[PDB]
Design a protein around this ligand. Structure first.
Ligand SMILES: NC(=O)c1ccc[n+]([C@@H]2O[C@H](COP(=O)([O-])OP(=O)(O)OC[C@H]3O[C@@H](n4cnc5c(N)ncnc54)[C@H](O)[C@@H]3O)[C@@H](O)[C@H]2O)c1
Ligand SMILES: NC(=O)c1ccc[n+]([C@@H]2O[C@H](COP(=O)([O-])OP(=O)(O)OC[C@H]3O[C@@H](n4cnc5c(N)ncnc54)[C@H](O)[C@@H]3O)[C@@H](O)[C@H]2O)c1
Ligand SMILES: NC(=O)c1ccc[n+]([C@@H]2O[C@H](COP(=O)([O-])OP(=O)(O)OC[C@H]3O[C@@H](n4cnc5c(N)ncnc54)[C@H](O)[C@@H]3O)[C@@H](O)[C@H]2O)c1
Ligand SMILES: NC(=O)c1ccc[n+]([C@@H]2O[C@H](COP(=O)([O-])OP(=O)(O)OC[C@H]3O[C@@H](n4cnc5c(N)ncnc54)[C@H](O)[C@@H]3O)[C@@H](O)[C@H]2O)c1
Ligand SMILES: Nc1ncnc2c1ncn2[C@@H]1O[C@H](CO)[C@@H](O)[C@H]1O
Lengths: 461, 461, 465, 461
């Protein structure tokens, strides 16, 4: 008589279990942690509030935390990212999950609240696993008493880490965090190669458009922008890249991209006259990758080529000015997470109007909204880091330290390089890769241990 | 009556000047520093011992240092890297240079000694520019009194920085250094994209071999290994990558390379039995990128496919066991910097023997030995960093500080991110790239200044 | 629906029609050659009186083809040429427009044959068909074997695909072909567009939808390096797969080598003597993904399937399901459906499986065309070329009126032909303009210098592109 | 006492022999023909006038024809294409060769004349091997008596075949020809993949310019244009493609190139107004691939970005209007086969002028002029076809046929597909490729013989 969940359709559970059993075979670092630590139960007593895309891959993470002794209460960090069969499989395993694909904003907030509360009272939570910081922010604003008993936060993504670092700077962060994002086996795996796999995937599922020989503008050339640019270029798109960071821009040039600004001489003065109308008039696809606000603004949307596709693979819905499009233009649903945005006006539209844009996932994460996000073998690295970060912070028991000792441990930190390397090795073995062992003379020659770490913490890979 | 130089052929000077004038047009960051600092003469009174590849690109660096007020005495850091027309053009400008292509080891040492000594006595040197640490080591071992008057070292390359850091750890480093290598506009420009341009270049000039559809083994997947692997794969080579670092190996896998070891299960126990003879029997091209010793060892060389090409783009000549090949096998010169190594024995060889390897540049830096190394537009970034580093250390005047103040400034440092970004922006403008400017709201949203820096010092790009 | 009381169709779900119409309106904007033909020929109605039996994948793209034929004056009766290729929203939109269509995703073999029969028969009697549009030759074969009298009134066949063309040429050689045909496949704007670039787009698409597997850094074996093999190999290599290519044609193998692929055989020294000992078990033990592209039989045979790495994906993008020995797998191994068109094939035996068994293969679309079975096949802008050629071929054969010729005149016109290069060039130009491409015009001096007309054709018929 | 040759320097012979011995190991189809036909001497009595680039690769062809019993007299078909060490090695083998790198037009004609005449009288020639048709045209215009006794022409290249077909159409062709170009193992090997290898090679040797991130315009998208486009794109160039053939243009689009015209709406009026000044103002590199005339015209050259590189990889130097540049602009030699073309005027230039173009190989074949042309393993296919074509026409003995029988055999033909496949198989084995054999059932199923041919003559590959 387990009822402590809310999912689209519990009857999808058997399908979800079939997909979990396949995904496990794609996730050797995660399954290795299960086999290694199952006996020791290092998360026994851990009670984890989890807020991350309720996908099959997240399912393998959840069941790894549970297999290591954790109890969890789970929600999605995005209204469109859930795989309903994954959510069903987790609910049917007796794990509290509050997630479905196509939540309203009200339902999204209700789902997070259902993780925080059990039977109408704060759950005895002592750990947080977050993606983007929404759960972190709700706990700090609304449930500070709960944070007193929480040993730490493990934060998945660039945007969430930024929000943690703001809180640390302002003296408002109440518990230590591990920045899972900045593991090399996360940032330079998931952020880059995940988006390389999943961006063209989502655009194909959403539009089935030929990409080869068409014009893309990728806004950003960080990890996600690099992966996104490659996703499109490898399909034969002609990709132009926009950046504010000259080092990232230099990388775009050397990687064989033309670096352009949507604005004349790169100056965004907020006027239509500032828009390079000739450039935007030629673009078939714009992708936002920034973690920033209004990088595809109203004036850019007005200037875009007719029938251009617009999408966002970085954070929230405000990289693209969707608020402007809701206020001014008529939305025609093609199918779920695909809208034609008719630039002819707000009230009606002509079914045969040629002056529209195609918006994917209403400007939310396109890879998860219009496809299934990163593949298992990539998320294996991110999620092995999550499990190790949960173990580290849980075992440190911050909430049980004296005030003086808390002051010294209240930080946002990355996992040590040795763990990053061990996750990498399990990932390499999953490809059938064979890593060479240094000889003693070779290890002495370059000044490292035969078992590593092989690089100083300053190394950028 | 200028005679304070030694070059192959002074009559090549006019040709060298023609090539310097073209190279200047490819090096906007360097020529920007000339225009910026020429008036102020920030290196007036600087007396720079330089030891770096006497190429056309090094020529533009030398003339930038001189245009900012430096005097220099110059040698090459490699016996095969000099462009004789570049050396001639620098000598013809009245700058002391001791460099030619195809030096002996004795001539190499003599050339460095001719920079250190002027008219049989130590030069009144006060700055060092080094590539690989040979000049740095000679000053510390043989001329320690000269280091009393030296304000600093600016070190070009990964291997040289390793040697500096050993000296710092052991308390044997006598003057502060700038690690130029670990600027992003050096390491993730020069080390990677330089080798992408110049490795297939050198292999074509040396062998004219088709690379498409043939089998390569790249030992190492650091910045040089990454660029080297792309150099070959973009030509259609089937590239396998060897690594000791599982994170680098993980990147090789994600980049679409098979990761293999020369040794069964990656264990080099020193025996022939440990060699994967089946793997090495299929390899047409082996490239070493490691900075390590004996990564292409005698047993690997014995097991390699007949008529395989062997080359090193890392350091020294000891990445490949060339000593074993000189001791055991007969060398037939095809043309300069190309030898057939006859595995039939040491004494004679049959002109028609089928059992040989092709060694490029006698196992020394293949890009500079068999071609012209990195292109001007790439070296522009490295050398803009060198000039800014020379300015910083010269203006700090370490050698004139009291003992107490020296103790605090005796360090190996990178340039600030802000300077790295300024070099990057000049490089981007040379591609016709346009960097977007953040709005105040956007800069506040992601927590950076509109002027940058745009990333924390932890950012890996 | 549209027509009062219309019931002359069978589709999965008529309520998908509005959705299908939304997708047709988008696809039209991606298909300028096809929409150009509509605008050009609408007034002239060159297919007025044409009654076309069509058998091709009932996709959104096929929907734009059908409505082009109807806009030019044709009546049609339509079925899919594959049990898994139909997009049910496309089928619904076509039925709702009052066009007879018999197609759904996930037909049985019985349902497949019934659907073709429903195009051929109207109210239980042969339709007064006078044209055939076919993809793979099944409808062509049924008319020749079962309804020869209907071919007396048929002016021509226009055939989409390599396999169908092969079957037409066998019929011509054997003197059994009863009406002339246009080989649409061998337009350059078909073969070297659709067969290659279509598969480049749609193969990795179908593998992602079907498995969501990371391809980067994993090992693929592509069997074949014709147009489909070339496009398939690029689909995987551009994702970072380590692709090995098998071929029987040394010229295609040479192209694979030059394109940067290792050319290997499943069999030692390339000799398939039918023994297990002939299988290169070491090579197949390393393969994560096998793709068949040949149009040939048993190119991924039982012994190869036995030797494949555990949890390898197996799929076919060649026109029929016998490229892989699926019959051997149905006979010997237990099939576990993951989801539609995805099965785990448990090599532990026939009767039952352990849910947690590690010794299985993943088969996509039960060995049938994987791009159409697990995704949506080629994109609109590619199918535009193929389908512009189909419309031109239909116009040509319908206007020639073969069925109304005297016996002596028929003998001379009974052939399998391609469209003239000038039409191939005109399709290509409309495709280029859809990319915003600008084709240069030769000067008179330049046209004289290379010996062509300023208007083309620009190449002799021998040119291979 | 062998003196029947003219080369740059006979002392280069030993070096040329070293390179021939290596090149043989890269050319298994050619070396296979030697082993197969040695004993049978199928070219015994053949006396071949050869006119093709006197490269190392051509050396292996010559020595194959000689090993099969031919005598030859050889010249280059290009003033810049000879490798002087190859010419020396062939002369030192007692083979008449008249070729050096850097011929004048007068020297070029004299060299062809020295093949045609022996001791001041027509040689007893009975076979012609040609590349571009210059020798073929001289024989038809000036030596028709010699053509009476010639059994055939084997023609290497697209331009030469066009010239043969015009002669056949006009009834002026006097002997049958094999179109060696349209073997698949020639056209879709040499013309495409050869240029992919050798175009970026020649641009690097000639300029050492970084190509990554820079803008290229490739005029033409035939076999050479396809390979040239890839040569640049694989290096990271942003490649735009021009074409007059909409099918080739369609292929460029699908291959992921933007298709542009130098002229507004593609219409060349002959006026400056017709030039797209904005487009040409952004181009760093223009490459002509057409076999057509004035496809990089005077107005395009005037509009090109300052310091753009201009080159031609089509068979003759009239693709670029070099005549306009000789008439109007000052040429500064950088080094052999590299000129700065100063757009400031005809009589003198400022050494520091910024307004110049860089022209490679004075507008002649850039791959052979500035590098070594196609690699051995590619030329192996072309030259295996040449040998089989020489055998076929020599054995047919056209010159000895009655007039009635000649009339029936006077044609321009390709080799049978079966021979194309046999060359391909030897090329594949040189990669270590393993071709599968059809079963009898499989062969019957697709309607071919187990031993081929595998495709109908209509197949395009
Ligand atoms: N969809 C996914 O699966 C996925 C994967 C990982 C991360 N993310 C999200 O993607 C976003 C980016 O993450 P990242 O790791 O690449 O961060 P990053 O800091 O590496 O890169 C972001 C880049 O955006 C650039 N940028 C900022 N404002 C810009 C503007 N106005 N114009 C142009 N460029 C601008 C910055 O200079 C920076 O290089 C974040 O929101 C992150 O959480 C999503
Ligand atoms: N030739 C040039 O123009 C050029 C350019 C820059 C740097 N370099 C030189 O290249 C070398 C590498 O530079 P880098 O910046 O790539 O350094 P790096 O540390 O980034 O990369 C070296 C890599 O070698 C790997 N490695 C070490 N021992 C190995 C072994 N036994 N087998 C396999 N892999 C092994 C390490 O794990 C590391 O990832 C240095 O010697 C550097 O000075 C040369
Ligand atoms: N799925 C799609 O959307 C799509 C696209 C177009 C064509 N097709 C089908 O794809 C198939 C191939 O079409 P194509 O145009 O590429 O034909 P093709 O003749 O160009 O290529 C087929 C290749 O298979 C090779 N081959 C034959 N037997 C082989 C064997 N035993 N092992 C290895 N290679 C072998 C041949 O040598 C040939 O090169 C046909 O069935 C065609 O109808 C499907
Ligand atoms: N340098 C070498 O090693 C090498 C190799 C092989 C062939 N070639 C020569 O290269 C040339 C091309 O050979 P190919 O086999 O590619 O010929 P091709 O006919 O295959 O290609 C030439 C292309 O140029 C296009 N073209 C013609 N005029 C044009 C114009 N004004 N603007 C744009 N495009 C135009 C044509 O449409 C055609 O597609 C010939 O001269 C051939 O002999 C040189
Ligand atoms: N398939 C997936 N399952 C779960 N999380 C994912 C998936 N794909 C991407 N993500 C995560 O989404 C985050 C952005 O919210 C990224 O940091 C990435 O780690």
């Amino acid at each position: 008589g387990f009822t402590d969940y809310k999912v689209a359709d519990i009857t999808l559970a058997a399908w979800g279990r079939r997909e979990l059993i396949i995904a496990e075979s794609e996730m050797p670092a995660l399954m290795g942690l299960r086999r290694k630590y199952a006996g020791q139960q290092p998360l026994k007593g851990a009670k984890i509030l989890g807020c991350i895309h309720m996908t099959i891959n997240t399912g393998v993470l959840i069941e790894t935390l549970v297999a290591l002794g954790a109890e969890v209460r789970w929600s999605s960090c995005n209204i469109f990212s859930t795989q309903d069969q994954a959510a069903a499989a987790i609910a049917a395993a007796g794990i509290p999950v509050f997630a479905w694909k196509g939540e309203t904003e009200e339902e999204y907030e209700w789902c997070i609240e259902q993780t925080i509360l059990k039977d109408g009272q704060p759950w005895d939570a002592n750990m947080v696993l977050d993606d983007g910081g929404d759960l972190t922010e709700i706990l700090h604003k609304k449930y500070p008493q709960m944070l007193e008993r929480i040993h730490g936060i493990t934060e998945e993504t660039t945007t969430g880490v930024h929000r943690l670092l703001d809180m640390l700077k302002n003296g408002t962060l109440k518990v230590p965090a591990i920045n899972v994002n900045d593991s090399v086996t996360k940032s330079k795996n998931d952020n880059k190669y995940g988006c390389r796999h999943s961006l063209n995937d989502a655009i194909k599922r959403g539009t089935d458009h030929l990409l080869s020989g068409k014009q893309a503008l990728v806004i950003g050339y960080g990890d996600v922008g690099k992966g996104s640019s490659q996703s499109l270029r490898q399909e034969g798109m002609i990709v132009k890249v926009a950046e504010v960071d000259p080092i990232c821009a230099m990388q775009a040039c050397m990687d064989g991209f033309e670096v352009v600004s949507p604005y004349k001489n790169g100056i965004n003065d907020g006027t239509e006259a500032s828009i390079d109308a000739a450039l935007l008039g030629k673009i078939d696809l714009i992708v936002t990758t920034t973690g920033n606000v209004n990088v595809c603004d109203a004036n850019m949307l007005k200037a875009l080529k007719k029938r251009a596709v617009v999408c966002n693979i970085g954070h929230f819905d405000n990289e693209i000015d969707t608020a402007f499009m809701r206020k001014n233009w008529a939305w025609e649903e093609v199918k779920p997470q695909v809208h034609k945005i008719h630039r002819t006006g707000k009230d009606g539209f002509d079914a045969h109007n040629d002056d529209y844009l195609i918006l994917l996932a209403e400007g939310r994460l396109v890879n998860l909204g219009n496809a299934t996000g990163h593949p298992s073998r990539i998320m294996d690295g991110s999620f092995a880091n999550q499990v190790l970060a949960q173990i580290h912070l849980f075992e440190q028991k911050y909430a049980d330290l004296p005030a003086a000792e808390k002051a010294k441990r209240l930080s946002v930190e990355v996992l040590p390089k040795k763990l990053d390397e061990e996750v990498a090795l399990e990932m390499v073995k999953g490809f059938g890769g064979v890593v060479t062992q240094l000889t003693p003379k070779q290890a002495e020659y370059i000044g490292v241990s035969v078992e590593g770490p092989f690089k100083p913490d300053t190394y950028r890979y």
